Amino acid sequence: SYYQMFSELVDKLCGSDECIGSGSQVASHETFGTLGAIV
Amino acid sequence: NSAAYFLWPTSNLQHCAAEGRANYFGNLQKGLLPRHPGRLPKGQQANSLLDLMTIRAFHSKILRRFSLGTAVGFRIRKGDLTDIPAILVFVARKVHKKWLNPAQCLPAILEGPGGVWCDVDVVEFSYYQMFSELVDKLCGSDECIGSGSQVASHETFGTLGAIVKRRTGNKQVGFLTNHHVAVDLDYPNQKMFHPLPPNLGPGVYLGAVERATSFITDDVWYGIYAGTNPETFVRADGAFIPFADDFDISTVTTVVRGVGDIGDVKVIDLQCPLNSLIGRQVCKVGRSSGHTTGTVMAYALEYNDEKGICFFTDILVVGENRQTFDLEGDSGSLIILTSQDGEKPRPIGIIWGGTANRGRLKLTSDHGPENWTSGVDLGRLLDRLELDIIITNESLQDAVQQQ
Amino acid sequence: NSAAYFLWPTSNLQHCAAEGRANYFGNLQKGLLPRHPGRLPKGQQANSLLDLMTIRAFHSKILRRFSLGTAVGFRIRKGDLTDIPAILVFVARKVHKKWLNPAQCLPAILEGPGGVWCDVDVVEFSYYQMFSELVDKLCGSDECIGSGSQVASHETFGTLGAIVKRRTGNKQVGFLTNHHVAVDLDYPNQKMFHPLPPNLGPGVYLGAVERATSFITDDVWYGIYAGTNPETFVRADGAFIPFADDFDISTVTTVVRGVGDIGDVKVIDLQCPLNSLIGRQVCKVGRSSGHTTGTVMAYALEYNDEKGICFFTDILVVGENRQTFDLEGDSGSLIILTSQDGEKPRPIGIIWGGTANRGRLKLTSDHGPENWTSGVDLGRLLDRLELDIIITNESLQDAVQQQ
Amino acid sequence: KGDLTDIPAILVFVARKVHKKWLNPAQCLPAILEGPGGVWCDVDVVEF
Ligand SMILES: Nc1ncnc2c1ncn2[C@@H]1O[C@H](COP(=O)(O)OP(=O)(O)OP(=O)(O)O)[C@@H](O)[C@H]1O
Ligand SMILES: Nc1ncnc2c1ncn2[C@@H]1O[C@H](COP(=O)(O)OP(=O)(O)OP(=O)(O)O)[C@@H](O)[C@H]1O
Ligand SMILES: Nc1ncnc2c1ncn2[C@@H]1O[C@H](COP(=O)(O)OP(=O)(O)OP(=O)(O)O)[C@@H](O)[C@H]1O
Ligand SMILES: [Mg+2]
Ligand SMILES: [Mg+2]
Numbered sequence: 001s002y003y004q005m006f007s008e009l010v011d012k013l014c015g016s017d018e019c020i021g022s023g024s025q026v027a028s029h030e031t032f033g034t035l036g037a038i039v
Numbered sequence: 040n041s042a043a044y045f046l047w048p049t050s051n052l053q054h055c056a057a058e059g060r061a062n063y064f065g066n067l068q069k070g071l072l073p074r075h076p077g078r079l080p081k082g083q084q085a086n087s088l089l090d091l092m093t094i095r096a097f098h099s100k101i102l103r104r105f106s107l108g109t110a111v112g113f114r115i116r117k118g119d120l121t122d123i124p125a126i127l128v129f130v131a132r133k134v135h136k137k138w139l140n141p142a143q144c145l146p147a148i149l150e151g152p153g154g155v156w157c158d159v160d161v162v163e164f165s166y167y168q169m170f171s172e173l174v175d176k177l178c179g180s181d182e183c184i185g186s187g188s189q190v191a192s193h194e195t196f197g198t199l200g201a202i203v204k205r206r207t208g209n210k211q212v213g214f215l216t217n218h219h220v221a222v223d224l225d226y227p228n229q230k231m232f233h234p235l236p237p238n239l240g241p242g243v244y245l246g247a248v249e250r251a252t253s254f255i256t257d258d259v260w261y262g263i264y265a266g267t268n269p270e271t272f273v274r275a276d277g278a279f280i281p282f283a284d285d286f287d288i289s290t291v292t293t294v295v296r297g298v299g300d301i302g303d304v305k306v307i308d309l310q311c312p313l314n315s316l317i318g319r320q321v322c323k324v325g326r327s328s329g330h331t332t333g334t335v336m337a338y339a340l341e342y343n344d345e346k347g348i349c350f351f352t353d354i355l356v357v358g359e360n361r362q363t364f365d366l367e368g369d370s371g372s373l374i375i376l377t378s379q380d381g382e383k384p385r386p387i388g389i390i391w392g393g394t395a396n397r398g399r400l401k402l403t404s405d406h407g408p409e410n411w412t413s414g415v416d417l418g419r420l421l422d423r424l425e426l427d428i429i430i431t432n433e434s435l436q437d438a439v440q441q442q
Numbered sequence: 443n444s445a446a447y448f449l450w451p452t453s454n455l456q457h458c459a460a461e462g463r464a465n466y467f468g469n470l471q472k473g474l475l476p477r478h479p480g481r482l483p484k485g486q487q488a489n490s491l492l493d494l495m496t497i498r499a500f501h502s503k504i505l506r507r508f509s510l511g512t513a514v515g516f517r518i519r520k521g522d523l524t525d526i527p528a529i530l531v532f533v534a535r536k537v538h539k540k541w542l543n544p545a546q547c548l549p550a551i552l553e554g555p556g557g558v559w560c561d562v563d564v565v566e567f568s569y570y571q572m573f574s575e576l577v578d579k580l581c582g583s584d585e586c587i588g589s590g591s592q593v594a595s596h597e598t599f600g601t602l603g604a605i606v607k608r609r610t611g612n613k614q615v616g617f618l619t620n621h622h623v624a625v626d627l628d629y630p631n632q633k634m635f636h637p638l639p640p641n642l643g644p645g646v647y648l649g650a651v652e653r654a655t656s657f658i659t660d661d662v663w664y665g666i667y668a669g670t671n672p673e674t675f676v677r678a679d680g681a682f683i684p685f686a687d688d689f690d691i692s693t694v695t696t697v698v699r700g701v702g703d704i705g706d707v708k709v710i711d712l713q714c715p716l717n718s719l720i721g722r723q724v725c726k727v728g729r730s731s732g733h734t735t736g737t738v739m740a741y742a743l744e745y746n747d748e749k750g751i752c753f754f755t756d757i758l759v760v761g762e763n764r765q766t767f768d769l770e771g772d773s774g775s776l777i778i779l780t781s782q783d784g785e786k787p788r789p790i791g792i793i794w795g796g797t798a799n800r801g802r803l804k805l806t807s808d809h810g811p812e813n814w815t816s817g818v819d820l821g822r823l824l825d826r827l828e829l830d831i832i833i834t835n836e837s838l839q840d841a842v843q844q845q
Numbered sequence: 846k847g848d849l850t851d852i853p854a855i856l857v858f859v860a861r862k863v864h865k866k867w868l869n870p871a872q873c874l875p876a877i878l879e880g881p882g883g884v885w886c887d888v889d890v891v892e893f
Binding site for chain 3: 040041042043044045046047048049050051052193218222223224227229238247248249250251252253254255256259272275346347348423424425
């Protein structure tokens with residue numbers, strides 16, 4: 001065929017931590033996204 | 040003998056209140072009384088609702104710059120109540136201190152005129168079916184009329200609030216409910232029936248609407264000024280309906296089914312210690328939810344809309360064990376303090392009912408958000424409406440003769 | 443000094459009216475007074491509104507079996523008015539006599555108690571932007587305030603009805619409009635501004651709403667019984683707003699722009715000859731249509747809904763030369779009789795405003811249907827509201843001092 | 846009056862145009878503006 005979680009880690013990844021790394025939340029004037037990698 | 044016209048309230052027609060507000064804020068600003076952020080004596084720490092409310096009124100500009108709302112109460116730490124008086128500020132998202140510039144960060148101590156000081160606390164916040172024998176009894180299967188029964192008009196439904204009598208005139212007997220049943224600017228809704236209106240099913244005719252109130256100026260209600268905005272209101276819903284002279288009054292009971300017998304109304308005083316209302320346990324019986332229990336969390340919640348209007352609410356309540364305290368269609372039920380030792384339960388409030396009368400707040404990271412409910416004080420509403428409550432059947436009969 | 447509660451009308455709380463209705467219909471049915479369909483003397487032909495209304499009330503069962511509504515007036519033949527009194531019955535479709543069974547066919551002569559007789563007429567019926575200098579002047583480009591100007595509240599708009607003063611108390615001065623601006627069961631709308639509210643544009647504050655009325659029992663309004671249904675109402679919209687004490691009263695004019703000077707209100711009597719109201723020419727000046735003229739067609743139109751409720755309307759008006767008489771947003775304008783020789787024009791009515799306040803009727807087969815408009819009587823409304831009208835500036839100043 | 850003049854000006858667009866009697870002094874716009882160096886121009890009001 002071709003056709004919401006609550007924990008401490010999710011809270012840390014969304015702005016409750018003290019560092020920036022893989023999995024963090026990034027945003028622009030409309031949408032959101034996940035940080036891919038450090039290069 | 041009067042004609043067929045409505046009359047409007049005459050309590051919001053004085054400019055002296057506005058002039059007094061302006062003078063009060065002017066003399067408050069004249070007496071800035073600056074003090075260095077040094078040692079604060081514990082003797083002038085707040086111990087009542089009045090101190091917190093006046094402090095919040097004084098510092099209402101810096102707190103409202105980045106907020107959704109404010110309230111007063113105790114400090115919440117790690118999902119459990121403390122015993123330290125505090126002012127609660129509501130935000131959409133809670134972040135670490137490293138991503139905040141100095142302007143946005145909030146202080147930890149506030150001080151008002153006279154040297155009184157309090158704390159600051161930050162909470163995350165949001166502004167956006169039962170089957171049993173009791174529910175069947177409340178909806179038309181019983182043989183009596185009392186608190187929790189279903190009442191109806193030509194469009195909507197509601198819950199019977201209380202059995203009351205008037206203070207002036209001939210001291211007539213009736214009941215207290217919410218005004219939503221009585222929307223008579225676009226269509227006639229002025230008769231009440233139990234359990235159904237004539238064009239939907241069988242029923243019996245109860246009476247006709249006599250009094251209602253929605254909005255009151257905060258100066259009359261609280262007695263003091265609590266804001267700077269010239270246009271402020273407090274929501275106080277109520278309606279009074281007297282019994283018709285053809286009604287058979289032998290079928291009325293003064294007992295609250297599922298609770299028992301109740302005492303007299305309990306008045307909320309703004310100079311009592313804070314622990315007599317914050318943290319207590321309450322219960323209710325409602326037409327579409329049955330029997331439920333919960334805990335009181337906050338008082339005097341403030342909200343501001345996009346058209347420059349401020350609104351206030353009295354009681355904020357949260358359910359227990361991640362269970363909702365109430366459903367839709369339960370508006371108009373009593374809120375009663377549970378008895379801890381000996382004495383009988385006493386009612387303190389009434390469920391308000393509206394559109395934004397509920398929402399979600401977060402306390403712990405392990406689970407999801409919880410729901411909350413708003414409530415209206417009872418003693419002030421009774422004083423405004425000039426009505427008294429009846430708690431015994433002997434007094435009910437005595438009033439029936441004495442009318 | 444009163445509290446912040448509304449009061450409700452006390453004129454619809456008497457069962458003696460229902461008992462009188464029952465007794466009246468019982469004794470009317472007891473006195474059937476049968477008569478053979480023989481020669482009817484011309485001396486007992488109806489000559490007033492009362493006779494037609496009582497005949498329609500007597501025979502209200504057979505007429506309502508297959509109908510959409512009824513009214514009284516003259517007979518319409520080939521698209522032109524006759525001079526023979528008649529009762530008008532409205533149907534959805536008009537067919538030839540050959541496709542009708544005897545039960546459905548309507549008689550040509552009706553007779554009521556006392557021997558009075560009248561005719562029957564059949565009409566087809568349905569229940570479902572201007573640029574000029576005057577429109578610009580009425581919307582904020584002028585230097586004065588008068589009839590036809592634009593007034594506004596926090597949501598809606600409206601037209602200023604008239605300049606009036608109260609009869610009792612201190613005899614305060616204000617203006618008369620429609621109550622739609624003043625919907626205060628769901629949101630505060632109690633201040634008035636010209637031309638715009640503060641959160642939409644510049645404007646000046648006028649006053650606050652004091653009185654309003656929507657529904658009146660027909661027994662009080664007409665003075666007689668006109669139906670058998672126990673639940674009957676008559677729509678009588680109105681609202682009175684007095685001028686604030688800070689308002690500058692030197693900018694008010696009593697002239698109706700586009701017409702001139704007007705006389706005193708003209709009362710409609712139910713015992714005058716029929717030709718003093720039927721067939722006359724009328725005119726109006728409205729905020730969104732300008733100046734228009736039309737002709738009066740019917741009186742006392744009756745309607746019945748699916749929930750067993752009957753409603754009445756007073757005036758039915760039709761425009762001239764296949765032009766609409768009014769648009770949407772013109773509710774609250776005066777309806778004035780045009781002067782035929784010598785005397786000044788006099789107002790008789792006010793445009794009601796609602797949702798089903800317009801529709802289509804057919805008179806000739808060559809063209810399409812035409813629109814019609816409803817109106818409310820003025821003298822009875824003024825009597826119910828206890829207000830008086832001011833027509834000269836000298837009297838305006840005299841009332842200003844005498845207050 | 847719906848016709849072009851030959852006087853340089855700055856045009857300001859408003860939703861509604863009203864008489865001067867219903868305007869408080871704060872909302873009313875001046876008829877002459879001046880900038881640095883002493884240069885001056887007019888003000889005109891258009892509905893838009
Ligand atoms: N404007 C703001 N928006 C979001 N977060 C803020 C803002 N101002 C401060 N904070 C953060 O909110 C937190 C303050 O938490 P609070 O005062 O409730 O502490 P607490 O009650 O002792 O702890 P707990 O988090 O266990 O309830 C700090 O981490 C602070 O950086
Ligand atoms: N229930 C009914 N539904 C539809 N048509 C009906 C009904 N009862 C009677 N009619 C028809 O309506 C007509 C009555 O017309 P009416 O009484 O208005 O006559 P008129 O005024 O002299 O003529 P005109 O048609 O020129 O106005 C007849 O043709 C009759 O058959
Ligand atoms: N903020 C405002 N909103 C609405 N109207 C305003 C405002 N400020 C000024 N006005 C009005 O706009 C008008 C100014 O018109 P304007 O400067 O275009 O004059 P003009 O070009 O000489 O005349 P014309 O109207 O014939 O084009 C005045 O009537 C003034 O009262
Ligand atoms: Mg905390
Ligand atoms: Mg005809």
